[PDB]
Amino acid sequence: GKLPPGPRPLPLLGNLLQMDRRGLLKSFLRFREKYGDVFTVHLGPRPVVMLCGVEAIREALVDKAEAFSGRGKIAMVDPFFRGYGVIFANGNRWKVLRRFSVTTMRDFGMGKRSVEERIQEEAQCLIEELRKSKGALMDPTFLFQSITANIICSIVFGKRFHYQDQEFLKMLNLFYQTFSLISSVFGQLFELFSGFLKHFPGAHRQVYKNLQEINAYIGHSVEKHRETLDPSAPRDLIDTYLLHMEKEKSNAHSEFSHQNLNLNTLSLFFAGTETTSTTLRYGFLLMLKYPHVAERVYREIEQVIGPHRPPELHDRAKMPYTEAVIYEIQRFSDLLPMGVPHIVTQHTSFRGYIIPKDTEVFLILSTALHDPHYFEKPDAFNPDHFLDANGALKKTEAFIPFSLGKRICLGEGIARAELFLFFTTILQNFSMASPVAPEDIDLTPQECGVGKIPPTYQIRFLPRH
Ligand code: HEM
Ligand SMILES: Clc1ccc(-c2cnc[nH]2)cc1
C-alpha cells in the first residue's frame, strides 16, 4: 500500500489548526482515536509518522530494529548538539560511540568502585542531609537534581559536589531551566516551525546559551584532565576516554576524531540528570497523595532489610511490592510520553503502509504505558498493576518506559539502580509528610512537551528513630 492516513494539512501550517491547544501529546492522542495506531501528522512542513500501542511499537523497534534505528532531531537542542553524543548520533558515529560506552561500563568497577557503590555513597550523603533538615518543609527539587547529577559527576569526573555548593546549584539551575524551556509551549511550537522561528529571539536561543555555558564548565574540566592525565592512575571515565583516544589517536578508524568528547559528556549529563530526578520527584508526590503506599513500602524494607544495613541491589528480588511501586511511578509519570524521535533509515513496509526513507517517527510510549488491556484503569495510580494475586512481581510487555530495540535507553540499568536505592534508602530512614491534604494534591504536570514535569510541592522527612 502506501502512506499512513492522517489529518489533511495546510502547505505551511501543516496540521497546526487540527492540534489540541494544550500540547503535542494531547493532539496526537486525538488523531489516534480517529485514525488508529499508525498515522501521519505534518509538523510544520514535515510529515511525521506516529506509532501507538504496545503491538505497533514493538513491531517497529524489535521486529524492524535496524530500519527504525535512526535518531530524529529535537528542534530545540539540535542546533547545539548537531548529531554529537550517543543520544543524537546516527549511523557509524552512533554505533561506535554506543559500543564503546557499553564496553567501558562493563569494565567500570573492576578497576574502581561499582556504579551501585557510588549510588549507595550518594544515598548515604542524602540521608545525612535530610537528617540535618530536622523535619523542615522543603521543595525537594534541588536535592533530587543534585543526587542524580552527582552520580554522573562521580562516574565521569570521579568527584561529588556538596549539596550547598553555590556554583554547583547555579549549574543545576541552568539544566533545570533548559528542560522546562524545551517542554514549554514555545518549545513545542519550535518543534513545528523551527525553520522560520529560528530567525527570531526566543527560548531556543536561551537553551543554546545555557548549553554553551554548561559545555564550558565541562570543557574546562576535560582540559584539566588532559593536563594532569596519569596513565598509571586513571581517575574516572574522562581519563578512560582520554587514554583510549591517545592509544587509538594514531589511526583514524572507529575514529575518535568524528567524535566530540565535550559534547558526548554533556549529552551524558543531559540524558542522565533530569528524567531520573523528575521520576524521584513525581514518586514522592505520589507517596504524599497515596500515603498507605509509602507505608507498605516501609513494611517491606523493615522486613527484608531492617533499619541498620544499607539497601543493596540484591534486595530488589526480595521486595516485589517496592519494585511494583517504582514501576507504577514510572508508568504513571510517563516522563517521555512520545519517547525520543526516531527516523526510518530505509524505505520500510509497516502494517500495509510504506514509510519513506528518512521519515521522522514518534513512538508514543505513553500509549503503551496506558494501554487498558494491560493496565485496568490505566489513568489511576495503583501498584497492583504490577502485582499478581500472590503478591509477586507481574512483569508486562506494555511496560516500556526506557523504550525498546537498538536505541533503548543506554542508562536503563543505572536509572533503575538509582530509583530503587534512593527510594528505599530515604524510606528506610524517614517517613514523609506534607501540609497539603491528598484531596488537594493535583498530579497534573506543570509542563508536558518532550518531557513531563511534576508540579512544585513541599515535603518534610521525619526520622524514624
Ligand atoms: C528513569 C529515568 C530514564 C528514563 C525514563 C529514560 C528513558 C529513555 C528513553 C525513552 C529514551 C529513548 C529511547 C529511544 O530512542 O527509543 C532514552 C534514551 C537514552 N537514555 Fe535514558 N532514560 C532514563 C534515564 C537515563 C539515564 C540515568 C541515563 C544516563 C546514564 C540515560 C541515557 C540515555 C542515552 C545515552 C539515550 C540515547 C540512546 C541511543 O540513542 O542509543 N537515560 N532514555
Ligand atoms: Cl530532549 C531529551 C532527549 C533525551 C532525554 C533523555 C534520555 N534519557 C533520559 N532523558 C531527555 C530529553
Swiss-Prot record:
InterPro entries: Cyt_P450, Cyt_P450_CS, Cyt_P450_E_grp-I, Cyt_P450_E_grp-I_CYP2B-like, Cyt_P450_sf, Cytochrome_P450_fam2. Its EC number is 1.14.13.-. Changing residue 19 to V: In allele CYP2B6*11. GO terms for biological process: epoxygenase P450 pathway; ketone metabolic process; steroid metabolic process; xenobiotic catabolic process; xenobiotic metabolic process. The keyword Transcription regulation does not apply. CDD domains: CYP2B. Phosphorylation is accompanied by a decrease in enzyme activity. It is found in: Endoplasmic reticulum membrane; Microsome membrane. One of its GO terms (cellular component) is intracellular membrane-bounded organelle. Expressed in liver, lung and heart right ventricle. The keyword NADP applies. Keywords: Endoplasmic reticulum, Heme, Iron, Lipid metabolism, Membrane, Metal-binding, Microsome, Monooxygenase, NADP, Oxidoreductase, Phosphoprotein. One of its GO terms (molecular function) is arachidonate epoxygenase activity. It catalyses: N-(5Z,8Z,11Z,14Z-eicosatetraenoyl)-ethanolamine + reduced [NADPH--hemoprotein reductase] + O2 = N-(14,15-epoxy-5Z,8Z,11Z-eicosatrienoyl)-ethanolamine + oxidized [NADPH--hemoprotein reductase] + H2O + H(+); N-(5Z,8Z,11Z,14Z-eicosatetraenoyl)-ethanolamine + reduced [NADPH--hemoprotein reductase] + O2 = N-(11,12-epoxy-5Z,8Z,14Z-eicosatrienoyl)-ethanolamine + oxidized [NADPH--hemoprotein reductase] + H2O + H(+); N-(5Z,8Z,11Z,14Z-eicosatetraenoyl)-ethanolamine + reduced [NADPH--hemoprotein reductase] + O2 = N-(8,9-epoxy-5Z,11Z,14Z-eicosatrienoyl)-ethanolamine + oxidized [NADPH--hemoprotein reductase] + H2O + H(+); testosterone + reduced [NADPH--hemoprotein reductase] + O2 = 16alpha,17beta-dihydroxyandrost-4-en-3-one + oxidized [NADPH--hemoprotein reductase] + H2O + H(+). Heme binds at residue 409. It comes from the Eukaryota. Its cofactor is heme. Changing residue 145 to H: In allele CYP2B6*6, allele CYP2B6*7, allele CYP2B6*9 and allele CYP2B6*13. The modification Phosphoserine is found at residue 101. Pfam families: p450 (PF00067). It is an enzyme of class 1 (oxidoreductase). It is a peripheral membrane protein. A cytochrome P450 monooxygenase involved in the metabolism of endocannabinoids and steroids. Mechanistically, uses molecular oxygen inserting one oxygen atom into a substrate, and reducing the second into a water molecule, with two electrons provided by NADPH via cytochrome P450 reductase (NADPH--hemoprotein reductase). Catalyzes the epoxidation of double bonds of arachidonoylethanolamide (anandamide) to 8,9-, 11,12-, and 14,15-epoxyeicosatrienoic acid ethanolamides (EpETrE-EAs), potentially modulating endocannabinoid system signaling. Belongs to the cytochrome P450 family. This is Cytochrome P450 2B6. It comes from Homo sapiens (Human).
